[PDB]
Amino acid sequence: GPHSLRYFVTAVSRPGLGEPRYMEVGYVDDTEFVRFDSDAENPRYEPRARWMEQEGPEYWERETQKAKGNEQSFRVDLRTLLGYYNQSKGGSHTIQVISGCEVGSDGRLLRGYQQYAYDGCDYIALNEDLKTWTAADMAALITKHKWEQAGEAERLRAYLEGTCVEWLRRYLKNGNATLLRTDSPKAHVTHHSRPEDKVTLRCWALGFYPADITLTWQLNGEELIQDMELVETRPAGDGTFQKWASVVVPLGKEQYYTCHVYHQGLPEPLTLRW
Amino acid sequence: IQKTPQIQVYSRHPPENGKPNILNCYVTQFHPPHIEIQMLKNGKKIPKVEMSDMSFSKDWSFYILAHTEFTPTETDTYACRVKHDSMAEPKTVYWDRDM
Amino acid sequence: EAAVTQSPRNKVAVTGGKVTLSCNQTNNHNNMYWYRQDTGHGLRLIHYSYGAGSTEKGDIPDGYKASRPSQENFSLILELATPSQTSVYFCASGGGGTLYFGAGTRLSVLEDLRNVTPPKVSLFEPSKAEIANKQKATLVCLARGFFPDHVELSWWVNGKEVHSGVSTDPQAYKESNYSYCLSSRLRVSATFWHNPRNHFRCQVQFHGLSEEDKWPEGSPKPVTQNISAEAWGRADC
Amino acid sequence: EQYKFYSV
Amino acid sequence: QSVTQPDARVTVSEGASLQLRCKYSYSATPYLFWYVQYPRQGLQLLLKYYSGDPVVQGVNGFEAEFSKSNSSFHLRKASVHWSDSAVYFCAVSGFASALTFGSGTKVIVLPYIQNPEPAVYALKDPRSQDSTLCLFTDFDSQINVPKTMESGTFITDATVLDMKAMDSKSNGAIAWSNQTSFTCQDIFKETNATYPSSDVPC
């Protein structure tokens, strides 16, 4: 199945409170495999997974370095962005980026991205082709001409097409179990009394791994996701998650309602009724 | 940019009683990364605010998982307030047990 | 275009002298540098920047400092100058790893600014044997007694510079524990050599002290000069 | 293994 | 972070194939490169390897092949041409926008020469008395002009030269001493065909 290895970078200037906070987080798929923090006691790239243990002290040191570079590397950006917009010092700002790629079973490269986010609104980014850049505002204009008149596109393109990939593989080589493991959600339902001879039926799902899941309520073979009630998935806070949904149904009319839990770690979707 | 934070509070396991569990305060969809998140037990802050390492998602927003630790009893009332520059006043959120 | 202007390109400075070399560009490349070309070590990194203000240490830091005022002007600064800092200095702009280097700078700081000597060059002439025996005419050009090898020897036939059949050892050789020496061998034909009209000139641009330097002597000043020899086409008989 | 980002 | 050009000097016969060794140490895919430096100007880039095809095709018949197993980015050009005699440097980009160059390699491509006319001459400086010198000339690239153990008696290094018409690919080494009437004939011990200063009428 498709897989990824994206990198999340963020530098936020805290004028006065010192030098900007900078840190990058590594994600092979949606698991956190490595991060680095400026406000760290001992700044150093840190292994956010047992298996990352198989990576040498050299690896750490290496990226450790590479990081610190990018550290002051972004420090610059900040100034530069500031100048470009005509805004004087003072307002703490946040630069963020997502650089990454996506290989799929055959190893072919599905997608490569590098996107610059300034203070929360799209700055610039490398198009699908991996050759041009797209930017908003007369300012971000100045920036493209730069990255292009320097080869950036190309050099970037190599990382994505070659580096992130060769590595993404390696990571998977050793992270497998941890990344390929499953945990079947545990569901149940609840009856919540309510005025006007009606009750709230809530379908609980929790203890499941892979964070993607779908829940649905039915009344004899018909979807009710419509006037239903949902909650963004809850990090169960222990390598697993939680999610529920519910709907109002006349009292007594419970037995006629059914919830469905479809989750990739389930041979047969889960089916509950009251 | 100004983006009001989403907050959910809950426990890991089911909210039993007189039995140890844990409590969280998942806040998301807010922007300027800087925030004050407070977990209280009766209007009074708790000592161990075990907080997670900052992150973000595809639309630039920031997520974070605060988590205390506890043994509940029907009597109490846990909740959370979250200071952020999107909202004027801090917004509290009450732990709804069997939500 | 994308020019890496590196000035000055040469200097004979004194010990304990504060020397600053500047580098102007037009590549818009944020990443600027200062490397040092010395034998047995090739080039080496002194200092580097990422844009105005951004400044960090390279691998050869001792004694060197740097400034980044414009997205253009970069500059390696030596205050407590010592001859160890004698070398060809190179700076450069660069995006990710596409370094665009510059012309260079011959850095010669000394213990005594008096130990010097503008080149003493003289023009020799073609061995008639070569002349007759092979119908061409080599006319080597020697240069002696000079201190800062910041020299470049060119040829000047009938009024224009030469490159046709011209070869100079790029590196001047050790004459004495101090006098360096340089040589080259222009070689034109017989027909051409044998014409009292077509002229031959030999020029050795030399680089030492400039206008405001300290020349604590009552003797001739050894500044950037151009001492040269001359010859003419001799008959055939 | 991460990239070596450029300025802006 | 480490680079090595085992041999800083290699001389080759013009035409022939050229391969300059290069090793590097860094447990990861660095950014390797090769710059050229000839007389006075600074460095010049030939190519760059970021990632991708281990075989890079660059400017002026110059190409290299990246390799792992035990590191390498050996440069290569088959039809060497005189003008290529120079200093070729191999750089890497380790922990950020830096370029950790290695020692280097001065290569020398001796030209081809149809006619070995190892004739020695003697030239006198027209602007003074006894100001002569010994000029070795038009000899065979593959040869070796003797060294100096005589003070004041200096011999330069083989300095190939080329004119405008035909060839003239000629080596040549200058010599001069402050020692009495020494004969070029003498100084160039193991050399050939010396013609003296005896201006014949015909």
Host H or E run for residue A115? strand A109-118
How many C-beta neighbours within 10 Å does residue A87 have? 12
Of C112, C143, C142, C159, the closest CA to residue C206 belongs to C143
Tell me which residue in E42, E119, E172 faces C185 most closely, judged by beta carbons: E172
Give the C-alpha separation, C191 to C196, whole Å: 11
Token pair listed for A86: 């005509």
Structure tokens at C91: 């700076």
- Is the distance from CB of A127 to CB of A101 less than 8 angstroms? no
Q: How far, rounded to the nearest angstrom, does the alpha carbon of residue A267 sit from its chain's CA centroid?
A: 27
Write out the two tokens for E147.
Answer: 């060294």
Q: Which residues, 6+ apart, have CB-to-CB distance to A219 below 8 Å?
A: A249, A256, A257, A258
B8-14 long-range Cβ contacts below 8 angstroms, 24+ apart = B8/A231, B8/A232, B8/A234, B8/B93, B9/B78, B9/B79, B9/B80, B9/B93, B9/B94, B9/B95, B9/B96, B10/A234, B10/A242, B10/B95, B10/B96, B10/B99, B11/B70, B11/B72, B11/B95, B12/A236, B12/A237, B12/A238, B14/B98
| Contact assignment for C165 to E161 by CB distance below 8 Å | yes
Taking the C-alpha atoms of residue E126 and residue C155, their distance in angstroms, rounded to an integer, is 18
Tokens read off for A126: 């490398």
Q: What residues pair up with E202 in beta bridges, in sequence order?
A: none
DSSP for E112-164, written as a single string:
P-S-----BEEEE-TTSSS-EEEE--S--SS-------STT-EE-----B--S
Are both A160 and A191 inside the same structural domain? no
Q: For A214, what's the count of Cα atoms within 13 Å in the CB-facing half-sphere?
A: 7
Same domain, A144 and A221: no
Given a contact cutoff of 8 angstroms between Cβ atoms, the answer to whether C213 and C221 are in contact is: no
The token pair that represents E176 in the structure block: 């001069």
Query: Which residues lie below 8 Å from residue A28, measured CB to CB, with a gap of 6+?
Result: A3, A4, A5, A168, A171, A172, A175, A179
Radius of gyration, CA atoms only, chain C: 22
Interface contact A232-B6, CB threshold 8 A: yes
- Residue B21 to residue A4: CA distance in whole angstroms: 34
Which residue is listed with tokens 């990576």? A55
Q: Are C97 and C36 contacting, i.e. CB atoms less than 8 angstroms apart?
A: no
How many other CB atoms are there within 10 angstroms of residue A122's CB atom?
Answer: 16
Distance of CA E123 to the CA centre of its chain: 26
Residues in a beta bridge with C130: none
Domain spans of chain C, in order of start: 3-111, 112-236
Q: Is C96 on the interface with D (CB under 8 A)?
A: yes
User: Chain A contact for B94, CB < 8 A?
Assistant: no
> What span, in angstroms and rounded, lies between the C-alpha atoms of C145 and C142?
11
Q: Which residues of E touch A163 (CB under 8 A)?
A: 29, 51
The torsion of the CA quartet A23, A28, A30, A32, rounded to 10 degrees, works out to -40
Domains of chain B: 1-99 (2.60.40.10)
Domain at E112-202, CATH from 2.60.40.10, 3.40.50.720, 1.10.20.60, 3.40.710.10: 2.60.40.10
The tokens describing B17, both together, are 């009683």
H/E element holding E93?
none
Q: Which architecture characterizes domain C3-111 according to CATH?
A: Sandwich (2.60)
Distance from CA of A168 to the nearest CA of D (A): 9
- Record the tokens describing residue B11, joined without a space: 């426990």
CA distances in angstroms from C65 to C18, C54, C106, E2, listed in the order given: 11, 13, 18, 25
Q: Find out whether C76 and C89 touch, Cβ atoms under 8 Å.
A: yes
Measuring CA to CA, how many Å separate E73 from each of A164, B29, E23, E70, E91?
Answer: 22, 49, 7, 11, 10
Residues 6 or more apart from A90 whose CB is under 8 A from it? Answer: A15
Name chain D contacts of C96, Cβ cutoff 8 Å: 4, 6
Determine the Cα–Cα distance for residues E46 and E32; give it in Å rounded to an integer: 11
**Domain E1-111: CATH architecture, name and number where available:** Sandwich (2.60)
Sheet with E174-176, strands from edge to edge, namely E121-124, E132-135, E174-176, E154-155
Assign residue B91 a region (left: φ > 0; alpha: ψ between -120 and 50; beta: otherwise). left
Residue ranges in chain A assigned as alpha helix (H)? 57-85, 137-148, 152-158, 164-180
> Strands E121-124, E132-135: parallel, antiparallel or unpaired by DSSP?
antiparallel
Answer yes or no: do A77 and D8 touch at CB < 8 A. yes
Report the C-alpha gap between B60 and A110 in whole angstroms.
22
Breaks (C-N over 2.5 A) in chain A follow: none
E94 CB neighbours in chain D (<8 A) are none
CA distance A36 to A27: 12
Å between E133 CA and nearest CA of chain C = 8
Q: How far is CA A77 from CA C183, E36, E121, in A?
A: 52, 33, 67
- Using a CB-CB distance cutoff of 8 angstroms, which residues of chain D are in contact with residue A73? 4-5, 7
For helices A57-85 and A137-148, give the axis angle rounded to 10 degrees.
130
The structure's method of determination equals X-ray
The candidate with the shortest Cα–Cα distance to C162, out of C131, C141, C179, is: C141
Buried b (16+ CB within 10 A) or exposed e, A226-245: eeeeeeebbbbbeebbbbbb
Tell me how far apart the alpha carbons of residues E185 and E120 are, in angstroms, rounded to a whole number.
8
> Tokens representing C145?
């007694």
Task: Give the neighbor-by-neighbor strand order of the sheet with A133-135.
Answer: A46-47, A31-37, A21-28, A2-12, A94-104, A109-118, A121-126, A133-135
d(CA B49, CA B66): 7
d(CA E102, CA E179): 43
The residue whose two tokens read 């040829």 is C155
Answer for the pair C12, C113: CB distance below 8 angstroms, yes or no.
yes
Q: Check the CA dihedral A10-A13-A14-A17 and report its sign.
A: positive
Region label for C232, one of left (φ > 0), alpha (ψ between -120 and 50) or beta (otherwise): beta
Domain that holds residue A112: 1-181
d(CA A175, CA A54): 10
Measured between alpha carbons, how far is C168 from B31 in angstroms, rounded to an integer? 68
Q: Does C28 touch chain A (CB under 8 A)?
A: yes
Nearest CA in chain E to C48: E98
Q: Which of A44, A61, A155 to mutate to test the interface with E (most CBs of E within 10 A)?
A: A155
**Quick one: which H or E segment has residue A30?**
none
- Cβ-in-10-Å burial (0-12, 13-18, 19+) of B75 comes to exposed
CA R_g for chain A: 24
Residue C190 at interface with chain E, using a CB cutoff of 8 Å:
no
- What sign results for the dihedral spanned by CA atoms A42, A43, A44, A45? positive
Q: From the CB coordinates, do chains D and B have 3 or more pairs under 8 Å?
A: no
Strand partners, E107: E10, E86
* Interface contact flag, D7 A73, Cβ < 8 Å: yes
B8 touches chain A (CB under 8 A): yes
DSSP string, E32-77: EEEEEE-SSS--EEEEEE-SS-SEEEETTTEEEE-BTTTTB--EEE
In this structure, are residues C203 and C186 in contact, taking their beta carbons and an 8 Å threshold? no
- Number of H helices and number of E strands within chain A? 4, 16
Burial of residue A186 (number of CB atoms within 10 Å: 0-12, 13-18, 19+): middle
Contacts of B57 (CB under 8 A, 6+ apart): B28, B63
Q: How far apart are CA D4 and CA E92, in angstroms?
A: 14
Is C7 in contact with C106 (CB distance < 8 Å)? no
Q: Are A113 and A124 in contact (CB under 8 A)?
A: no
Number of residues in chain D: 8
Class at the top of the CATH hierarchy for domain C112-236 = mainly beta
Strand order in the sheet with C173-174: C120-123, C136-146, C180-189, C173-174
Q: For residue A3, what are the contacts with CB-CB under 8 A and spacing of at least 6?
A: A28, A29, A102, A103, A104, A168, A172
- On whether both A132 and A256 belong to a single domain, the answer is no
Residue identified by tokens 């193991």 is E190
Cis peptide before C8 (omega within 30 of 0): yes
Among all chains, which residue has been given the structure tokens 């153990």?
E149
Residue C11, token pair as written in the block: 């200097």
Rounded CA separation A75/A13 (Å): 8
Separation between Cα atoms, residue E103 and residue C102, nearest integer Å: 19
Give the C-alpha separation, C34 to C46, whole Å: 5
Selection from B65, B9, B57 nearest residue B29 by Cα: B57
Contacts of C32 (CB under 8 A, 6+ apart): C23, C25, C48, C49, C68, C74, C91, C92, C93, C94
**Separation of alpha carbons C220 and E59, rounded Å:** 49
Amino acid type, E6: P
| DSSP line for B28-89 | EEE-SS--EEEEEESSSB-S---PPPP---TTS-EEEEEE--B---TT--EEEEEE-SSSSS
Q: What is the 3-state secondary structure (H, E, C) of chain C?
A: CCCCEEECCEEEEECCCCEEEEEECCCCCCEEEEEEEECCCECCEEEEEEECCEEEECCCCCCEEEECCCCCCEEEEECCCCHHHCEEEEEEEECCCCCEECCCCEEEEECCCCCCCCCEEEECCCCHHHHHHHCEEEEEEEEEEECCCCEEEEEEECCEEECCCCCECCCCEECCCCCEEEEEEEEEEHHHHCCCCCEEEEEEEECCECCCCCCCCCCCCCECCEEEEEEECCCCC
For CATH 2.60.40.10, list the domain ranges present in chain E: 1-111, 112-202
The answer to whether B99 and A190 have CB atoms below 8 angstroms apart is no
What 8-state DSSP symbol labels residue A159? I
The helix or strand, by DSSP H or E, that contains position E27, with its residue range, turns out to be none
| Contact between chains at A143 and D4 (C-beta distance less than 8 A) | no
Residues of E in contact with C96 (CB under 8 A): 31, 93, 97
Domain count, chain A: 2
CA–CA separation, A172 and C133 (whole Å): 78
Q: Does C50 touch chain D (CB under 8 A)?
A: yes
Report CA Rg, chain B.
14
Determine the distance from the C-alpha atom of residue E20 to the mean position of all C-alpha atoms in its chain, rounded to a whole number.
Answer: 14
Contact C138, E136 (CB under 8 A): no
Q: Are E90 and E101 in contact (CB under 8 A)?
A: yes
Q: Which two tokens stand for residue E40?
A: 């006075």
Rounded to 5 degrees, what angle do the CA atoms A20, C54, E44 make?
A: 135
Domain check: are A112 and A24 in the same one? yes
Return the structure tokens found at A128.
């699908």
Cβ-based contacts of D4 with chain E (< 8 Å)? 93, 96-97
User: CA-to-CA distance for C194 and C131, rounded, in angstroms?
Assistant: 9
Verify that A107 and A135 share a domain, yes or no: yes
CB atoms within 10 A of CB A256: 13
Return all residues near E181 (Cβ < 8 A) that are at least 6 apart.
none
Question: How is the beta sheet containing C19-24 ordered, strand by strand?
Answer: C5-7, C19-24, C74-78, C64-67
Q: Are A166 and E52 inside 8 Å of each other by CB?
A: no
| B6 vs E202: CA distance, rounded Å | 109
